[model samples]
Target chain A: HMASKQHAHILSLARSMIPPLHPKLHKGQAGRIGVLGGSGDYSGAPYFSSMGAMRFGADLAHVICEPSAGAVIKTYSPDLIVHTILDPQKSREDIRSALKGVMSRLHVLIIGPGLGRDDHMQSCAKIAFELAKDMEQMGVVVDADGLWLVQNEPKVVMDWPGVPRIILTPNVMEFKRLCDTMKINASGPHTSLCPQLATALGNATIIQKGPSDIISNGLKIPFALLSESEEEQNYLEVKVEGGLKRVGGQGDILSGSTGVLLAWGSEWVRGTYEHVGHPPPQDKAIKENIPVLAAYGASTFNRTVSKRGFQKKGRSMVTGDLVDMVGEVYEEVFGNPGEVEGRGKL
Target chain B: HMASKQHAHILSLARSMIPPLHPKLHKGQAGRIGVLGGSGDYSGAPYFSSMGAMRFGADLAHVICEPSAGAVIKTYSPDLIVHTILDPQKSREDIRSALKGVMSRLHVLIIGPGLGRDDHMQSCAKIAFELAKDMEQMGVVVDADGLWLVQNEPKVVMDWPGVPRIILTPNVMEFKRLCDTMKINASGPHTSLCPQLATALGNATIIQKGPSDIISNGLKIPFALLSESEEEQNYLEVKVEGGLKRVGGQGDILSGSTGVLLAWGSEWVRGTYEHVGHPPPQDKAIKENIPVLAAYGASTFNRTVSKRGFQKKGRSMVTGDLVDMVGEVYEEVFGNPGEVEGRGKL
Candidate 1:
């Protein structure tokens, strides 16, 4: 079914794309992820997300929030590249100008996880997303309040000119809300339904996280959720032995982990397409399905960490504890979990 | 002579008064300690103190300080909830009004440990203390340069309108200055004399911290310092087998730890008095001595932590080295090291 075969290729593609360690490599070569979040009301959310990216193998993580929120986030860990001021008081054009340089530096941006619902922050999110349109390889993964901003005005991100790479991750409620706001299908099995929703969203990919995380870019399978692979269509589902604890901020880790894969996936596509001496494969798997594949990887990775973290800490689990377990669990998600292991197969 | 015996009871009382730990207990139920210090130059002090409260078993510890300091403290650890800016430019009345809401949520307020002495900062400390008095459940642990502000304008805190159990912790020199200012005898025996000095300051409990901490409410062993069965009296002292290393940041740890006790002290007194079920034990020990007992606990804990730390790191030990020892040292203080331990004694 759709949950098994296509999802397997998605994981294989995600796993195969990982850049291996070479002492010959310099810093920032792997990936640089940016988190646009945090305000007076919440600070830890962005920190967890950014750190998750770095832990999942992004070379560097940067945070851009309100200037006042910078101090707390920066001090949480010196390893992060934190920019507290995006010049909120400046004009829209000025704000757009300020974000251009930062957006250029990051490989993929995770928009919102504790990004407050205030106008000033929501305004910043739209500007940051639109600015990414000018970049050659950057992709933005929207989650948390960023989802709220999009739900309020679907075009804030969707209508922007982009490839099929921009991804929106919404939990059960967020998915329903996004479907409602965008005038997409409101009911049906996600396998049979998400593609239509993704189709309605233009070229963008949509991930509805659930007991079985479902992904669609509205391409191939019109009715069959998990039919044979085809051109242009993107669909995959993420599920494994996930943990039982339902803690706040786990989604931030998901957004962060997803951002890392988007950076890798987007960056990989560019490097492959731009190969000089020999022509690289112009195949569909390497092009259209990477974002959906990356989302599957992130969803699977998050649950494994949450479940594994639960195995150790149980009810005492917090998001940071889950973040701390990422290094070990990354191997389980992407590396060689032993043969015959009941692992995150997708 | 005094350091060992009374100090042991102080540790005993601290262990006994520890909030009974049950799985059902909620966050901030053990204690929520706040430290209102840290400015441009001295950020580490508040961080150390706040962590000290947590290490000593407080459920939560928060730091409110200058923006520049917030950057340093927040990065130091994600464990603390930190807020920057107290509007130093505001009037005394305005600042006090600002603190009124904050003081309501905090159980104990640690007034000064590396709290700066600038006109702006001293003014803030003054307002924070005066405002704390208005909170029926709030208690204050005045230490470090907090004592300096009190020394300059005794009435800023001393003549404050109401009674919300006040504790003043002064070191050897700080105690001497308090005596010099109040015209109390610069006496030889602290256990015998501190009560007189505390009485001179009105209804406040003054703890003279040193080689052996001396506690007095101007009473002559009204309830002998470490008696098995005690009567109603205000006197206790703490001196324990501690380490040789004396570092600068250690007092912040004590101030923060004492603040935890003060909050617990005042809170425990109320819970005992207002019990709806068949009343709690009618012992004088639990009724009126939780704060002083907690102070002695903080002092002994600091010294013993130093001693154990010195035993390991010796001359290389810093205050942080001792702060690191709180988890095990706390077990040593509250849990039966050799027996089956169900700890957090109070």
Candidate 2:
């Protein structure tokens, strides 16, 4: 089927985006990601998100949250750096300054894992959004309560040059809220909802999660034959089956794994720009296409992790189980970076 | 053909040096290792190095690091003793005193896994080098940025008694820097560089790590019969292939594992000297030959870990994966230390 061919092509491109693990690269060269959430009420979300990133081969993962949450998160794993800067009592300026310092070092920012919906937490989220946009190149993945902030706050999702450089992942309820708030037509076919929402948000990428993931950057395709061409597709559908169990923190895994891919894609594009012999692609050709590749890759990977975790743990499968399977599933799908083909005896 | 025979003989020597597991041994007698590196930005390196040593059967592994790095390293594993003695805020005298106190207990010191190039960290490395030499019998493995200190500081690489009692492991770039700094001509054959560089450093051992790890201590034999004789070969070459995928922290495993071997070799030699009936071998014999055994053993064992880890993980293999395989690989290569030969068969 043409659809099967298209899916295979997309999967291949997604696989290419992973940076090979090498000796010449120093610390933080692979990926330095930050998870900006985690409050007293919810520390597991940030821990899952950040640890997921590390398992996906990121060099470093930082969890920036309130002190109480950080103190607890630190004990979950020492692999992450926990910055306790999201205090409710701190002045806006103080929090902003401290966040900016941490933001400068990160290649990817994952917003809203354990991010609560309190006034103070939402305010902190907005500040982080503004700071991330200021970086001009840092990739962003917003999910869970972060979707709530986007649905309610219009200024938080505005048009910027070179695309939004952000991907919004929302569940059924969160998608419904976004559609109602943005006045998007939800009465249309299920597959059309992600495209319409992405269009309504000035071509921002949307990964709507449910029985299947519908991914889109809201780019208009000229025609059907052109779609079969090497040109980027407007949207991709991931029907890879996952575990039947509905885990609460599973979405955090999706966001964090996707965060790493975005970081890799963006850094790859940046390195391309630095080479004189290699002329950089147009904004539409490369920069705007990063979210599509990242979304497809992470969505497929997350689903496989769920499937594997479920096979092992069945009904008892939790997000931590999925977190542990990230590395194993990645190698199965991508076939390990730089692995020699036909490596057995001739 | 003779080379293959020599390799087998060298490997057997390395296998013999792994002290048998016995209840009579005290805590530190097995191995007391110190990893003298780690900074705010690079905690993972030191953790991998120290954990690697512990995995290779070292009884105690201490991570000596900066305060910012130690605070995070302590949370990685309770098996390691993390000392936050490398603070830049403290005076050089205070830092030196604190470092010497810790150095006295260590049988081996692995300098530089995550030692950043900050002036203070470099200074601390020099101090640790001096203190290790003062201990006379402490084995040292200098890698990563510690090699940087050696390349830049002439005083750090001076001729010393007991054949320097140190081994330098360097990647290609680091090896290039060392050669250029010492003005050693590299236009000759590749195999000759390590021996020449070792000679220039007053017979300090060198493990030039790459596709083939060329290990030498710059000792010249009287003739070919002696080279083939039981009287210690000057150099050993280990070409056992590792994983095709080169992960960043894999080299730290080499340094840490080598540290364990050196500790075992040195301590074994010391025990021989203590025996009234057993006269110790001359400096030309067992004393200088210790480096050959340690280098060849660690190099081969490290390669096996990489090979085994890659077999299990493919392209997704990281340092931690290799660390987990150390105990398994060690047992496979050397057999169970106290295992009786034919009990199971009978």
Candidate 3:
């Protein structure tokens, strides 16, 4: 199947891009992520996203949310540093300025796990967009209500007049909304549509997740493969072969994991471009977008874990069950970290 | 190896001082520890300490946190009695008096766990310090963000000019911060400077947890023999043993357990002076500062439990895992509760 051997090489390179375990390494060196989404009405979304980031390999994960949502998120895990930036009485500008300090430290800011469309919430998301897009302090991962924010103001997300390096994970419905808002056509196949949207958004990657996921950043090149393959004209399609259970928080898990991978991939690329070492092929598609690589990696990882969870408890599976499966998938995919040994150039 | 050997001797003595079990003892008689932390941004710190206290055999564990954090901390485990008196919306005077009620019942107040740097949390903590110092009822064990408080304003924690029964715990980085704030040259070796630093704080005890845990009360003595025997003064150094894994929450475990031990030690010392039963040999350090003894006791307990947990889970071990193993460590080190315990005069 297109899902099997085709993406295996990219997955390996992505895993290899993970920094090696070392005695001298500090806590935040591996990855430090900020998840900007949580309101009084929703606490679990940010928790899942933040937890997923840590589980996926971020050394430190923070969730920036409203004060009302902060305590619940804090209770979820001691590992996270929950920043309560959104106080009801506080002005949007004031909250945004305060959280700007919080965003200054993250390697990646994953927006919209449960970010509501309240005016203030959207305002905060826009500020987060400015911070990540401005200084390259962090790459950005957008999904869920984050997509809503992007649809409302694409410039805040991608039209930074530079590489926003923003990766948007939108489901079919959200993708349709995005297309309509951005004035992109929704008539084309997933292949054409994903790249078209990405290109329209000024090279910001789009991870359009469906029964099969399409990973793309809109810089088309030579021959396209069966699945997403240089061979990825502008997109990589990862399909669900069998027994893949769909669940509510599954997308959140992917979003969280994708943020972490993107952070790591961004680091790898930055370090590589600075010094030496070549990035593995297929690891870079026709678009050669690092975020797309990370997205593809997360997609592959998410599918594997979800399928494994489904294997154990078919219809009865929960997001938590899938979370547990993440560890197993790590073991299988990033197996024997012991073999990673001492650091090599790449 | 000599350090471990010395630490082994020190730990054995500390373990022996754990009061014997008795049916006649009343609740809250053994230990009543309060954790003064937990806010919108963080709840894990206080939860770890509070739960660690109960797990380590305190008669009761109470967490005094912000109003917003109460439910979440309560939801973490039903065992803890959560008092949410510190609400940002409320006046500081209101919170101080309410917290006074919470502190009135505690034998030891473990300050700074998840205490946020926000104005309200710090103000509450400072008030907590005032209440504890005013009554000397809550012997302090300062850690985490609490250490940050001490670093910023040492007087709030140790400025009684006489008996600061407070036990300040600072790690390598924190120690540097402390030294910098207090204007002490850290160029002096840890072994000497730890006690030196503690002494500078008007005899406030300090436990520096690191490669070697240095327990000191800033007082210099001819020879710090058994606490009950001669009540001497000095410091201790517990080295890194094979099993002591670098895990989170171990310090909170120490903080929680230390509170209970100090409360228990206070009762033990006070009762011993009034009634019969000779002080155990090699156990009486001069002046018999109960908080210092408790610091030693906690330092020993944390190392042993951490080592055991690490042996079991390796790198996968976390603070929570260490908490789960607290009882096992206690049983292994202190043995079964026995008839040696008696309420002679409380």
Candidate 4:
């Protein structure tokens, strides 16, 4: 009942809060997203994630990866601004300076797409988390190796100031690891574990991906996973859902999409409810509500795109194919499907 | 007379070699393409090439560019995997090591889309040629500055064993340069120049791009020139082709599409003849045919997408817009044109 109520609240808030795109609006006025991941062993993960954000209608998508991974990730798409900073074993200070530069321009940061659990990578992420503390204007979506960083040191982001809109997307194994770290029982119903985890993370929103993704922000439980099995097969069949059957990078897509949505949601809240006029209470409410709405929007968009891709490609669909469907998904949801009119005057 | 017969033979080979698409097959099964190009002054080139590969139905497209150029290209589209490498001043060994990692994963490699003609960049190209010689399974497509490298040092790839499938996509200037290096008469027509150049390269396929794209191996010439002058006139008059005419990166599109086609052609040959139990002679026949079919397919797809982009955006159709059309072209060429499905599934 609490989950259903919270789900209804999220939907209602999303419906009321997300504004329609104006015809004359310029590019990037809606949202800009940054992705932080990719290392020696992995490049496709961040590519899939950052591209997912672009497909989902973020005007801009940037990726900050390790020097070893940057070129490979950059090779994935020309639409991302790839920063090569986090070397595999770079000093912590070097990483912090690099991250500070990256954080200055990004509206929302998606961490841990292809992040390997290397000591240096973990150190860089920790620094990123510290830098993220001062990024009050930005929202963060942590997934994949990023979740591992938080699991390793829960206090790094458990109650981070200025990062009120934090969305942690973890698959079953990742969720289990986090639960283990938090000393929560692992054998409970899949739906119940998410709320407890969310509570333990200082009420930060958690999207525990599974047969049905469970969303909780400590205050309420919101079951965002679609109930219709065959009808909603696309969302459930994502790499994260299919992880039991396959081994690859599905959580990366979720985190990347969540990051974009979080950025968009924050923009929506800032532009509408708090557009230089709203009272402090109203602005605070909007800020608190943004992450949930963003999570819902992201989940819905990712599922729809995945379904469309699967319908076209079937079992052959990979994360890249799903990402390819983002533009169409954005157009279908946001209405404009921004045309390739001419060169945007950069 | 010999050229005409060879053209007919190549066409037959291509037709026999092309494997019909199975409904059950997935993306990347068709092909995976990687393009190496793009520098600070030419970001649009690699983007065009990578997108061109995707448009031609390569399941995946990767672009390796310079660091300064990577961000600009990444901003062009989310469909490509963009790698930022090729420091113009970096040591050849360092660049080669970086390329080795990316080249390992690519099914086909297209070199020199936006590759500048700097001495260091040319040395990098030489290293790529060396790598291509050793890559038994990977097909290599060289164009633009790559051709420049080959012309300067013909011995680099001239007779490398097991690298017979190299596809050299050169335009008029490049054709002349190759002819001069290979000791062919400089005054010869492009059609004649193609075969001579191919012969000089140890029978690698040569696709000389222009108003007419002449495809040839050392033994045969297959021409796919635009015969519809009236239609061309209409496109030119309507400013459809005019918009992209003066653009800096159209050659990259041609090279990129050729790269993907070269990969698909190799795959089709390997899949249909070797794996499917066709005789070795039949496999050789099909393999011989691939370059022409790929050239035809790529040319058709690129022209159509460019025309559509120009119709909408007029004289403003940049290579990026054409790159965006790669998916639409892919859907048109490879995907079912009309398929409607349920909401839950894509």
Candidate 5:
């Protein structure tokens, strides 16, 4: 099956983005991830998102949420540095300044996961999204209520120069809403609709979450890999077996997990020397579509977590159970981080 | 004897619930246990309880205690998440809300280890017990001072909607006290008395702690399984040889160990996915008596921990040594978790 062969090909491409584990690497070399959501009613989403990144090997995770959410999220784990400056009571200038300062330090920022649909929060989301546009090397992930903002104004992400550095993850209803609002057909097969949505949004990467995640960047295939008689395919399908239970907050984990890979993608694009031993992808196609590769990696990774979690936890499994397995599952799916160079499988 | 044969039958039923050690699991899939008992004077109980769960293959363990107890428990081990929210200094409303939030995240909670007999602390225990009842799927294991609250007010646990989610572990004196309070005969054989007490208390599973722990859920054996010649027996006994020197915090270890199994049991009951290759018990009796099976498994597990730790540490063996042996003892008792489908013997 060429599709099966191609699935393995894309997985290998996704696998290549992981930074090697070397003794000489400094702190931020792995990645510094920022999750921009956490309202009073939904602190667990942000906590799971931030922890998901950290658990998947990001060096640090930051949670930028409302003050009330920050208080509760801080209690959940000490691993995350909570920034409580996304306050509606504070001046927009103060919120913008604080958010930009945090944004400047993050390699990738995941916007959503408990982001409330209030006017003030949507305004704050805009400020963060705008700040991300100016950071040439920063990768952005929009999910959850963050898609709400995108549905209202698609131009925020469309036609931007850094569009390749962004990925949108939307489960069922959210994907339908975006497709409907963006004038893309939502009723077609996901493989086709996903690519259409991505193309309509200026070649931005899309991870249309469902039973089997369909990912596409809507970019043209390199001429070298295309045959004269072959039709071009611009999308990849991930049919990994996921958990049986569809508990809430798994999407937050998906956003957080993908953000780490995006951070590594940005670092690779920035020509960093820290990734050591593991060189960047040599294929021009893989190099140009880092965000798409990242979506494939995280989508598969989350499903693996779900599958194993469901196997053990059965119906009682919750989102936190899925979050706990991140560290062990990363190594399982990506292979050992330090198995560089001389490592040969028997 | 058929009774002895049945005992092995129940032990095997308990063993099947131990989630396999597959590479795909996420963090809390094995289990997330919370110990809701620790006061100023008795912090070791909580430490032993939480660590026992972690060492037993639970992905995460939390200790929710008083401020002073949290300070001491944190110093004892970095593995446990110590939340010092059960403060008498805080208002009841504040304590109730905070404790409820933490309880909402746990798969199983082992309460009463190091729980002080203070009026305020007892009140907090009531708050936590009430909260667990509301979490339909959450498992509760009550021991030590937690049994004190149960003895005085049996109705708090009796007639609850989530009755099956509860397990009570009581030593000799505690068991005697409970029988006297509930108007049940304590002089009868434990196999009879345990079930009577369990039935008297609305079928809440009971683990009568002693040289050979006896467990029962007070329910009648399924009619098809019963024979005319067979004497009716509702309880299973674990007579595994333990250490000569009985340590103080061993019961806390038992509570902690049992809590993990109960967590898995709740997952089995609330089940979303069919266990991939390992199906849930086909026996109608085994399917309904999860708490009883969990008690049998943990009883055998704790004894093995005690025996192995004593073999190595001699008279100097402490609760920590038993805890340190949990990982080794778990594999030995349950068989290698992943040794399924001819993956070959470990």
Candidate 6:
């Protein structure tokens, strides 16, 4: 199908993933998220992401970044609990302890919004991966430099058993590198490429992100790709509709929002499973479902929010303007009862 | 005397309290109000109050909230100068340091609004009281959760000897609680509580908020008592005019407005008192009169604004709409001048 048809389908799939918010609830029960990025060279990416999470109703958002970038991120907002641990001199023990501490507090972890591809940072990401595996409950969203880490060492996440709802969010070139590293053919539409990557990675969700994001879990869903066109060949309209998209931090916003929604989706699934009295699986079903739901939700929501923000700011639209419209996108896509609610029921 | 008569007097007092706007004056010369309250749980309250103060003609407004709340509050509006020092671990010394840094720059300090009832929060309030005691030129207005502090520890502010310009705004329950704590015997009608409260607080002006607000400074002026009776009892007809009853955060709106008026009043007193030497306690006289003026001014201004908002939003009238009316109220109360007046002979 064309990208426009794919985009429309994915948008609906994303909407279906939202769980309704009820009045009687406690803090952090909705969603608790953590983001890993923000170097001295680029601080706005992490800020855009964390803010997007807050606007989407994530209760607690934490940012783990380079020490040099902490104050700038802190200046961006106090709502985000920033931990400056991405130092090059820190011993592995110290890095592990810091990563474990953050991992314990977060329901979902997003890596590489502004993470630079430095050797020291790459080692830190490796450590983060090991800790995330140990937690088992934490859903991980790998984007930006995170994709770089996977390309360098394909076995790190792919070799893990019952691959915990891991979502690999890669743009076109990143996806190609990932495919090359995993020995998969990259010469195809994202719809086909995404499913191949997901299958190769032990059924982990692969969010091949672009104008029409393709989400594939590789198992029961096989490959449910969302395109913006009604026909197989007419994908240009969907790309055109996205418009003169010359802005930075859009991906960061998407990744950060994806991180938060993943956490929310996991919580929703756990809550749902508990309420239904289903025997708990050996590992949580949320690990798989969360990435699928979050990826779908973030991809669709980011496009809609970007479109609206563009309407207001036109060519002058900055990442900050798009970040500000997170709340509006949330309310438009999901009705507000002042709480999280099921997407379509309300 | 009826409440309608008191309402008229309140409006008249407000008109008198408003000084003519001068084009020559620099920013913050007209008024500077400091709002103290911003905790992790309630950031919106202080933001609304600070923005209200700005809209009401205070050239600069400062907010002292928890470090966590400060960032979000600052992001909401750039006009505010938000300080983050209310963390519990920071202790009273930290609060003192923060206060010292900003206290000299402000003309009036507004305590409470969203000050949560945490014991550590109370300690910060206590420190603020101590610092405010030394500022002879500064005016203080205590409202919202601030009244809670005064009720719990009456001695903190009960007998501050030199701080003659203090305004206490209490709703009916707060008024009753203060009266009980101070052992003031109520006489005449229930609406006479304003004069009794003024007497109880050692001549500090009391704005007893109700449908019709009552203002009293324990002065023997015949019109003061009549003014209280007429305003307090008949405020519903005069202000609401068959509209919806006041909602949450309305008091915060009043407190912020009163803060601006107090600063403006002090400025007037300083200028008038200095020019006319050996004045009959002009500070005290203005203190006694300004609350009456602010109560009337804010009530009338708020009602007019509320009506305009209601026409636009119907039952959706919110505290934000009232805050947006601050500029309108300023222009209505103090007519703006386009150019500076030349030094003309009197």
> Which candidate wins on TM-score?
3
Worst 10 residues of 5 chain A by lDDT: A337-346
Relative to the real complex, the DockQ score for model 2 comes to: 0.15
lDDT tens per residue, model 5, A46-68: 88889989998889999999986
True contacts kept of 5: 0.00
Candidate 2 has an fnat equal to 0.12
lDDT of 5 at B284: 61
| Best prediction by DockQ | 3
- Candidate 6 chain A minimal-lDDT segment of 10 residues: A231-240
As a TM-score, model 1 comes out at: 0.68
Q: Kindly list the per-residue Cα lDDT of model 4 for residues B248-320, writing each as its tens digit.
A: 6676777777776677567766653344322234434345556556665555555666666777777766777
Better TM-score candidate (2, 6)? 2
Pick by DockQ: 1 or 4, better one: 1
**CA lDDT of every candidate:** 0.71, 0.78, 0.73, 0.65, 0.79, 0.67
Task: Tell me the tens digit of each residue's lDDT in model 2 across B106-187.
Answer: 9999999889788999999999988887777788899999999999985676766554578899988999999998888889
| Ten contiguous residues minimizing lDDT sum, candidate 3 chain A | A221-230
Question: DockQ numbers for every candidate?
Answer: 0.10, 0.15, 0.23, 0.04, 0.05, 0.04
lDDT for each residue of candidate 5 in B112-228, tens digit (9 for 90 to 100) = 989978898899999998988888878889999899999998886887775377899999999998899899976787588888999998898899988788788787655423325
**What TM-score is obtained for chain B in each of the predicted models?**
0.87, 0.91, 0.87, 0.77, 0.92, 0.82
Q: Score candidate 3 by DockQ.
A: 0.23
Candidate 6, residue A201: Cα displacement in angstroms equals 4.4
Tell me the docking grade of candidate 6: incorrect
lDDT of 4 by residue, A150-185 (tens): 898898767666637888898778889999998879
